[PDB]
């Protein structure tokens, strides 16, 4: 856990000042004033919707979720109100494949990528047993959500440095594109559909496209192909005074 | 597309269940009322060049200033564009009268109308004047049966309220 | 991202070289016209809405197929969506003009935009036309050459800044091509 | 309150760091330019009853229809209401010229103006006509020094752009 | 939140009164010492770590019960949290000194802090001592009266700024009492 | 994930075959050296920090271009991350040695690592060198052959465990190649 | 890169708005103070082999034990490595004096310095001794003008604090 590129090649995360005012004897939090709250909501819209170019006819329906937010500063309940709206479902549930919706939730509300097939299976079982709202409630009330973002910050794609598995890093970069990249390029057809169920990894170029500035992205590519061969059994020796031993 | 079937199919999808009889009941509601709703389909379809005729000129009469220099109606083909731009709304109310809900209207004419009508400086009061003209230009007995007239008016004042 | 001062710093870091007095004519001259750049940026951002509203209308003017059914700019949604984009590109070129470097243009706006437009079916040629109209009226405002819209300035030449902003619009035009 | 200080200290708060010299540099920028921007404040502070005088009547002259029955200016005290409602915007540009940013304007006059001006049917073109009147009514050298006129106009056309 | 210029604006808004020339002596005098305030804030933030390390050690100096088992500052975890809170109080009083207004202190740092400390069992008197050492350490740096740490300044009196920052520390001290 | 006992179980499940007495020599012999494996794993994890700091320094020793400007390990950030990468590999090979199976390595480590390094521009050859230095000193510690660092053990041969851990490091080396 | 411009344009990006005059005011703050802060640019640039000369030897004198066997300075080219490793910090304070903020230092020398200085067992007290040496080796009248010395020291004690 060092984040060699979290807070130096990337800006700091955005959100509420601090959670101590939540203890609330005379107020719930220092009135951030209306001009440092409209940028907070602008930031949330850019995250939970992920640059969906929402018109104001479609922002005339999120008035009620917003109006409670500036009154009672929990961010997590704001996104819980947003992800259950028709604005969220009509964009991400309506035209899409299933694991596409599931994987987009990891990008939007958790800021990381699905680490395995079993996580996707657990989400699938949890959806089948009565609704999609259960999926969002499991994610939002999760432990992982508490020990990553909490009730203060916008959920952002954090470079952890100390990932539980490496494919989690790859699949974080593939869902997160560049700026001016949205989530209706493919008509469904999730990007990690094949790679999750198979276990292989993703394209090197599309991961490198999403890296921040000044990170020597893309280089170091040998001109022969990139995916390794599981079936390879190479011999590599060590060096001994008498000879070379293939300690394999 | 906000339709009677679209709401029922989508609710069942969200709940992850098969269509129950509570769902089928709404399509039965469609079964009754399409006949009244689609009787006006004739009336708008075959008579439409005349209603835009009376609506656009009423719009321009109620606000005579807009033909002045620097306003929206300053030359000729902008007036032709105005008449086209109300023709579009008549087309959309016909589509909505066919689908059964406000599906076509609120995503093809209403969604985002506010940006175009402000940045191009088009007063919405002029649109609502022309639409309200046709709202009371209808008398039900001669024009339609009794129930087509209510539902046509109910769709018209929908976008009247939306633009205001 | 980078600016004019952070340009030379990273260039000299590739050499492990100190930023000495030889390299500071470029920056000290950059500071000489500092008031000029500030006088230019508010002139541009002061007409931001009119420039976009003029640009998309000019787009439509010689391509009436975009209004037609099946056109990419057919319904009010798509005008609204397209309308955003004229202003959004304009904001990023204004940022780049202010910073004196296009490092915040081809890394925050133009990265992956061609593919996004290809997937969405956005016509490239008409968008390039919209960008060029915006380009021409950017220079018109910087040089106080607009037919109306007389803005008070200080006398001198802003031609270098005009060339700069034209070069910035150039790379937007070439990024989606 | 969007000010030069509130930007930098909020940024430092978000990053969780002490104010560095990059932060102090902006307040130095304030130190230079308050004198020029504060000159316009006093000018507008004293002469404010005369500018609304010339602005409201220009608004009503450019759109004469607005006094017609059923429009916004149909009786007397609605016209008085209009003149008050431009007085408010002059007050807010004075406040913004004092704070240094667009803080007061975009949260007291701009934030939510769109609901009030559409549901009460008040054409925004009339507001922008009156504001653009004062934008060019002023002559930079005589009324002020050179640089107060720049920044006063820069604040005025801010809300001109915001309303359009 | 608010600053010195946004103070008078909201005060005059309660009267619906324009900000006229009578009210601008306070602000124009505020601008007179503008360089003084900037000369003071980096002097304080320039010694930020040493001031906090000195403050908690001074706290412990005359209250050795805090080290003792069961002390609120017993283990290294507690030696870490209490050492943070020095950075947070000091950072917020520096923000307030910079803005010329304490409208950022009791909404964003001091709001609800007394109850947080009561629930956590944090002793108030020792924390007040820590705040008062930092306060006595603040004025020393503003007035260039520190025994060591000679800082070059411009000659004059910064005493009004010293009273200002003392008043800011006062309300931190009284907020948790 | 799997271990040595869960290896044979899934192998026999592919045949729908019970785990009979014929297949339990491998596991019962696995249990015979159980104390040997435990005696080996703490010897390795007991020197965990020194092994990594020696490994990256050895990497740098014969590749001084990594320190150079533009090197992948140029600034303190990149040393810190590269320092982090060594512990992640060593911890996972220790897990695999403990479980007696590498079913935890290439699903929760190598699986999707080569592409991550390719996107980040991490040089493969130097990383392979770092892994092989770590490999050689893994065997040095298992066999009590380190020049210093005399550890008390029970007398016998741990050579099979040495070859096991060498095979585990082998697949890390081949996974990113 | 934490600079005066990068703060304000990033803030505008987060708020999704055009650059206002509150933003331009900070760049004006840069316009004044670059001349003072770049006057030290030559002073560090042309005199740098001498300051590391006096700084590294002061470091090694203040902690003589460090050359003992098993410490960081046990052979020759490790001492050369030390001198290089302070040369890097001088190169970064020059970069920061040029950009205007602490951009280059906190992401090229400070970010992640922790682990590197612990796992390779390098005492940070030795770094801060050498840096504090140059902090007071400076003279206000002889070395620079008055204000370059303030800001050079303000950048130096920045890292003298972080390292602590
Ligand atoms: C369709 C056939 C068609 C149009 C629609 C219309 C759009 C258009 N306009 C120009 C030229 C200009 N646009 C300008 C912008 C403004 N003028 C103002 O006073 C405000 C501030 C602002 C927006 C209303 C200006 C000043 C010009 C004159 C040229 C210039 O750049 O100054 C073009 C040509 C594009 C170009 O090459 O500049 C187009 C397409 N004109 C149409 O022909
Ligand atoms: C650069 C030219 C260069 C180095 C830097 C340095 C790094 C290095 N060291 C070895 C060999 C060993 N490392 C060992 C590790 C330790 N010894 C200890 O006492 C503690 C517990 C631990 C860390 C300090 C040991 C014991 C050895 C001896 C060989 C062995 O494996 O036991 C190498 C060679 C790598 C190898 O093949 O083992 C390198 C690169 N040496 C340099 O040459
Ligand atoms: C392949 C091993 C993976 C997989 C990869 C994906 N490809 C994606 C998009 C994509 N790929 C290509 C190249 C290829 N497709 C073609 O039609 C042709 C030539 C005729 C080639 C060489 C193209 C052109 C595209 C874009 C159009 C499209 O959607 O196919 C893709 C989507 C994300 C992305 O942009 O990379 C993935 C995930 N998909 C799989 O299912 C297997 C496992
Ligand atoms: C050091 C010996 C290497 C080297 C390492 C670097 N890695 C950098 C970033 C990085 N590394 C990994 C892999 C690591 N993370 C994991 O979770 C696991 C296994 C579970 C491993 C092995 C990841 C995923 C990342 C990116 C994570 C992130 O920061 O978001 C890195 C950063 C360079 C920079 O961008 O500044 C370095 C230097 N580099 C080398 O040259 C040697 C070979
Ligand atoms: C589901 C039901 C439901 C409601 C009824 C409203 C109720 C409501 N109103 C406001 C918030 C407000 N409500 C009013 C309304 C009024 N003030 C008056 O003097 C009039 C009596 C009245 C208008 C007729 C005003 C003026 C504010 C904001 C005032 C301000 O803080 O500036 C808020 C705070 C929300 C926020 O901004 O964070 C809420 C929850 N919201 C809801 O979700
Ligand atoms: C919305 C549409 C929709 C679907 C159609 C299914 C499609 C589907 N099936 C499975 C997952 C599976 N699907 C099957 C099904 C079959 N195997 C066979 O040999 C038979 C041909 C067939 C049954 C008739 C099996 C056996 C598994 C799991 C196998 C395993 O991994 O153990 C998964 C993986 C989900 C997960 O577990 O993470 C998905 C998405 N899911 C959906 O969301
Ligand atoms: C599809 C929607 C649709 C409508 C709303 C009407 C609207 C309408 N009315 C008239 C035309 C007419 N409409 C009427 C009818 C009436 N005049 C009155 O005074 C009574 C209130 C009312 C009784 C029903 C009369 C008398 C004319 C001829 C005079 C006129 O133009 O109004 C015309 C010209 C062609 C025509 O005669 O139909 C049209 C388009 N027609 C339509 O096709
Ligand atoms: C920060 C960078 C950034 C941008 C530069 C834009 C880029 C962008 N534009 C659109 C979306 C769009 N872009 C346009 C605009 C146009 N198409 C045309 O035919 C014209 C040439 C042009 C108007 C001038 C249109 C029409 C759409 C919507 C297309 C659709 O209906 O799918 C979308 C996705 C649509 C959505 O999510 O709703 C994106 C990401 N947005 C960003 O985030
Ligand atoms: C905070 C906001 C902010 C600004 C808006 C600018 C405002 C500004 N512009 C200039 C100053 C100037 N502005 C111009 C620009 C022009 N003169 C022309 O006749 C051309 C039409 C136009 C080219 C773009 C020139 C030529 C000067 C004088 C040269 C210079 O100052 O560098 C000056 C210095 C002299 C003066 O006061 O006029 C200032 C303060 N500076 C700021 O700090
Ligand atoms: C607080 C801000 C503030 C201002 C900006 C001015 C704006 C202003 N100027 C004038 C009045 C005037 N304003 C100008 C200025 C000009 N006339 C021109 O033709 C040029 C374009 C321009 C610069 C020479 C002139 C010349 C008059 C005299 C009457 C007139 O010209 O119509 C008036 C009407 C009362 C009067 O005559 O003074 C007002 C409100 N007054 C203010 O209190
Ligand atoms: C018995 C326990 C005990 C301690 C642990 C120390 C801690 C300590 N130091 C000071 C006192 C001081 N602390 C400093 C601080 C510093 N001096 C520097 O050169 C650095 C820049 C900076 C951090 C090292 C200074 C300059 C003084 C002298 C009084 C002052 O200037 O405020 C005080 C008095 C507080 C006051 O009233 O000001 C205390 C309690 N002293 C003690 O009596
Ligand atoms: C924005 C403003 C702001 C603050 C001021 C702090 C206030 C603060 N301190 C602590 C938490 C703590 N705070 C202290 C501090 C002290 N204990 C003492 O005896 C001393 C008086 C003092 C140090 C000088 C300690 C020792 C703990 C943790 C004790 C423990 O539970 O082990 C917590 C709990 C947070 C958590 O761990 O979940 C909070 C909110 N945090 C903030 O966000
Ligand atoms: C961007 C960062 C930034 C700064 C750090 C300050 C730096 C600074 N301080 C002063 C200027 C000054 N600073 C002081 C302060 C003092 N003199 C003393 O002897 C006391 C010990 C100490 C009290 C705190 C005084 C008295 C002046 C001159 C009065 C004044 O300028 O207002 C000046 C103007 C004259 C000069 O150059 O010295 C400047 C630029 N300004 C900035 O823009
Ligand atoms: C909970 C933690 C835990 C441990 C650390 C081990 C500790 C441990 N190791 C061995 C026992 C042993 N350990 C070794 C290992 C070696 N002898 C050598 O001379 C070689 C250098 C080295 C090879 C790696 C050998 C050869 C035995 C005896 C054979 C055996 O017990 O299987 C034994 C049984 C006999 C004894 O007590 O020594 C135990 C308890 N077991 C545990 O439960």
From Swiss-Prot, chains C, E, F:
Contains two covalently linked phycoerythrobilin chromophores and one covalently linked phycourobilin chromophore. One of its GO terms (cellular component) is chloroplast thylakoid membrane. It is found in: Plastid, Chloroplast thylakoid membrane. Phycourobilin binds at residues 50, 61. It is a peripheral membrane protein. Keywords: Antenna complex, Bile pigment, Chloroplast, Chromophore, Electron transport, Membrane, Methylation, Photosynthesis, Phycobilisome, Plastid, Thylakoid, Transport. One of its GO terms (biological process) is photosynthesis. (2R,3E)-phycoerythrobilin 2 binds at residue 158. The modification N4-methylasparagine is found at residue 72. Pfam families: Phycobilisome. (2R,3E)-phycoerythrobilin 1 binds at residue 82. Heteromer of 6 alpha, 6 beta and one gamma chain. Light-harvesting photosynthetic bile pigment-protein from the phycobiliprotein complex. Belongs to the phycobiliprotein family. This is B-phycoerythrin beta chain.
């Amino acid at each position: 856990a060092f984040s060699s590129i979290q807070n130096v090649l990337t800006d700091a995360p955005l959100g509420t000042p601090s959670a101590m005012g939540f203890l609330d004897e005379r107020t719930e939090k220092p009135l951030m004033g209306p001009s440092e709250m409209d940028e907070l909501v602008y930031a949330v819209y850019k995250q939970v919707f992920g640059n969906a170019h929402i018109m104001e006819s479609e922002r005339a329906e999120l008035r009620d979720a917003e109006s409670l937010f500036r009154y009672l500063r929990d961010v997590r309940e704001f996104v819980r109100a947003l992800a259950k709206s028709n604005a969220y479902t009509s964009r991400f549930l309506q035209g899409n494949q299933q694991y596409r919706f599931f994987e987009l939730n990891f990008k939007h509300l958790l800021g990381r990528g699905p680490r395995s097939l079993e996580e996707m299976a657990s989400h699938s079982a949890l959806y089948a047993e009565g609704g999609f709202e259960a999926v969002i409630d499991a994610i939002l009330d999760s432990d992982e959500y508490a020990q990553e973002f909490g009730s203060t910050v916008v959920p952002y794609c954090r470079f952890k440095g100390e990932y539980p598995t490496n494919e989690e890093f790859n699949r974080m970069l593939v869902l997160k594109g560049a700026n001016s990249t949205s989530d209706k390029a493919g008509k469904g057809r999730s990007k990690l559909c094949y790679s999750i169920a198979a276990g292989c990894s993703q394209n090197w170029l599309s991961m490198s496209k999403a890296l921040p500035f000044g990170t020597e992205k893309g280089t170091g590519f040998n001109l022969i192909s990139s995916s390794r061969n599981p079936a390879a059994r190479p011999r590599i020796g060590t060096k001994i005074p008498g000879g070379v031993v293939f300690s394999s | 597309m906000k339709s009677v079937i679209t709401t029922v199919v989508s609710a069942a999808d969200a709940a992850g269940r098969f269509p129950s009889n509570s769902d089928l009941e709404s399509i039965q509601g469609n079964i009754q009322r399409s006949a009244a709703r689609l009787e006006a389909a004739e009336k708008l379809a075959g008579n439409h060049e005349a209603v835009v005729k009376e609506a656009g000129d009423a719009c321009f009469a109620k606000y005579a200033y807009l033909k002045n220099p620097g306003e929206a109606g300053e030359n000729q083909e902008k007036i032709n564009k105005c008449y086209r731009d109300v023709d579009h709304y008549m087309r959309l109310v016909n589509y909505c009268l066919v689908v059964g809900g406000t599906g076509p209207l609120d995503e093809w004419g209403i969604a985002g109308a506010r940006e175009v009508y402000r940045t191009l400086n088009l007063p919405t009061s002029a649109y609502v004047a022309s639409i309200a003209y046709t709202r009371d230009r209808l008398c039900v007995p001669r024009d339609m049966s009794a129930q087509a007239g209510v539902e046509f008016s109910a769709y018209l004042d929908y976008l009247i309220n939306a633009l205001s | 991202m980078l600016d004019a001062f952070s340009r030379v710093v990273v260039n000299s870091d590739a050499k492990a070289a100190y930023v000495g007095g030889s390299d500071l004519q470029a920056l000290k001259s950059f500071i000489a016209d500092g008031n000029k750049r500030l006088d230019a940026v508010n002139s541009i951002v002061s007409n931001a809405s009119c420039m976009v509203s003029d640009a998309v209308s000019g787009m439509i003017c010689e391509n009436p197929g975009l209004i037609s059914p099946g056109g990419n700019c057919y319904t009010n949604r798509r005008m609204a969506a397209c309308l955003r984009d004229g202003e959004i590109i304009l904001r990023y070129v204004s940022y780049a003009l202010l910073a004196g470097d296009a490092s915040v243009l081809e890394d925050r706006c133009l990265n992956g935009l061609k593919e996004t437009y290809i997937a969405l079916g956005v016509p490239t040629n008409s968008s390039i036309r919209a960008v060029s109209i915006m380009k021409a009226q950017a220079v018109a405002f910087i040089t106080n050459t607009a037919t109306e819209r007389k803005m008070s300035f200080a006398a001198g030449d802003c031609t270098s800044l005009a060339s700069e902003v034209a070069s910035y619009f150039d790379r937007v035009g070439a990024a989606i091509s």
